[PDB]
Amino acid sequence: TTMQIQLGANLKPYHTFGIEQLAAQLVVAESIDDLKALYCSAEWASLPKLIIGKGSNMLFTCHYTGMIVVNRLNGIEHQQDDDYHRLHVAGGEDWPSLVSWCVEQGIGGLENLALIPGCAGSAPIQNIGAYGVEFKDVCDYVEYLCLETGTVKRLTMEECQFGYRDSIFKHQLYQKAVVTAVGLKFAKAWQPIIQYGPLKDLSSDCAIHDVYQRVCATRMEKLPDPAVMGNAGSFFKNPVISQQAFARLQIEHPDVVAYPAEQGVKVAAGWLIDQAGLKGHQIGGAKVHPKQALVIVNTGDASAQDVLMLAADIQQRVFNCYGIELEHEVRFIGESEETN
Ligand SMILES: Cc1cc2nc3c(=O)[nH]c(=O)nc-3n(C[C@H](O)[C@H](O)[C@H](O)COP(=O)(O)OP(=O)(O)OC[C@H]3O[C@@H](n4cnc5c(N)ncnc54)[C@H](O)[C@@H]3O)c2cc1C
C-alpha cells in the first residue's frame, strides 16, 4: 500500500504551522528507488513536485496544485575509527529522534541540536544551528539524488558551501537535488560546546547527557510545541551586518544584542522585535509569542495571510526603529514552488 498517491490531501499533518490547506497530490517516499521513480521516470513527470520533510520550515500560502513528496527514507548506520564516529543517516530520519539516539549511544557532538524538528535530509538545506553549533560542524558529506542523472551523488562538507542558514541546495542545487542521506562525523574526544543560553551554567567536564538535558529543558520551556500551537520556529534570520554598520546601530541603541559571525556582526532579531515592542502582537490567528519573539505562532485559526501580514508588520516596525531589514527564514510556498 506504498507509493499510494493521495489526492486532495489535507496539509495540516504535514507541516508544523498546522494551517488549514490542501495539496492536489501527495505521496510518501520510503526508499531511493521511490524517489527515483517519482523524479526520474515518465510516471508523474506531469506534476511539479515539492520535496518536504516535516514541513517545519514551510508556509503554504494557497491550494497546492503540484505533488507533494514526503521524505520518509529511513536508516541509521554506525561505524567508528580510533578517532571518530561516523553515521550514515537516511534523509527521512526524524532529527529530534536521531539526536536522542546519539546521546543514548554515548555519541558526543550532536546534542546542541537537540529537538530541532525536521528530517536528517533537510538539515543541510538550511545548515540548522542552535546553541552555537551548526550542521556544517558535524557534517562529513551529503548524498543526493541528482535530478539530471537519476543517480546518487556525494558532496563533501566543503562542497556543500554552508553558510548561516545557507547551502548549495538553496543555490546551484536548488530544485536539482533531493538529499537522500547525510554523513555525520564526530570526534571520539568529545568537547562540550557550552557558551550559549542556559548551557553557560554547565562546566567543561560535564557529560553529553548533561548538555542534552539542558538543551531539551530550555527549548521545551521557550518554544511552543507545534502540536499545541502551530509555528515554524524563528520566522526571521538574525540579520548579519558589517562591523561599522553595527557600531552605527549601537550608537543609538547601546543595548543591542550581537552574536558572533566571521563576516561582520549578527544581530539578535529576538531582541530587535522585543525592543520594537512587538511581543504578543496579533493579526487574525497569528501572534508574536512573548517568550521567544522571533516565533510567530498560530493561536488556532491563522491563515497564511495572517502570518504573512504579521511578518510584514514586524519587518516594517523593525526597519523603522533600526533601519534594519529582517529576512524571513520560513519558505513561502505558492501553487507549485516558493514565492517572493
Ligand atoms: C519549533 C521549531 C523550532 C525550530 N528550531 C530551529 C533551530 O533551532 N535551528 C534551525 O536551524 N531551525 C529550527 N527550526 C526550523 C526547522 O526545524 C529547520 O529548518 C529544519 O531543517 C527543516 O526540516 P524539515 O524536514 O521540516 O524541512 P521542510 O520544512 O519540510 O522543508 C524545508 C525546505 O527544504 C527542502 N527540502 C526538504 N527535504 C529535502 C530533501 N530531502 N532534499 C532536498 N530538499 C529538501 C524543502 O523543499 C523546503 O524548501 C525550528 C522549527 C520549529 C517548528
Nearest-angstrom radius of gyration?
20 Å
The CATH topology label of the largest domain is Uridine Diphospho-n-acetylenolpyruvylglucosamine Reductase, domain 3
Largest sheet: 5 strands, antiparallel
- The helix/strand order is EEHEEEEEHEEEEEHEEHEEHEEEHE
Report the β-strand fraction as a percent range: 25-35%
Oligomeric state as shown: monomer
CATH architecture of the largest domain: 2-Layer Sandwich
Distance between the termini: 37 Å
Keywords: Cell cycle, Cell division, Cell shape, Cell wall biogenesis/degradation, Cytoplasm, FAD, Flavoprotein, NADP, Oxidoreductase, Peptidoglycan synthesis
Active site: 165, 234, 329
Function: Cell wall formation.
Cofactor: FAD
Topology:
Layout: E1 6-10, E2 22-29, H1 32-39, E3 49-52, E4 58-60, E5 64-71, E6 76-80, E7 84-90, H2 95-104, E8 129-130, E9 133-134, E10 139-146, E11 151-156, E12 177-187, H3 208-222, E13 231-234, E14 240-241, H4 243-252, E15 258-259, E16 265-267, H5 269-275, E17 282-283, E18 286-288, E19 295-298, H6 304-322, E20 331-333
Parallel strand pairs: 2-5, 3-5, 4-20
Antiparallel strand pairs: 1-2, 6-7, 7-12, 8-9, 10-11, 10-12, 13-19, 14-16, 15-16, 17-18, 18-19
The structure holds flavin-adenine dinucleotide.
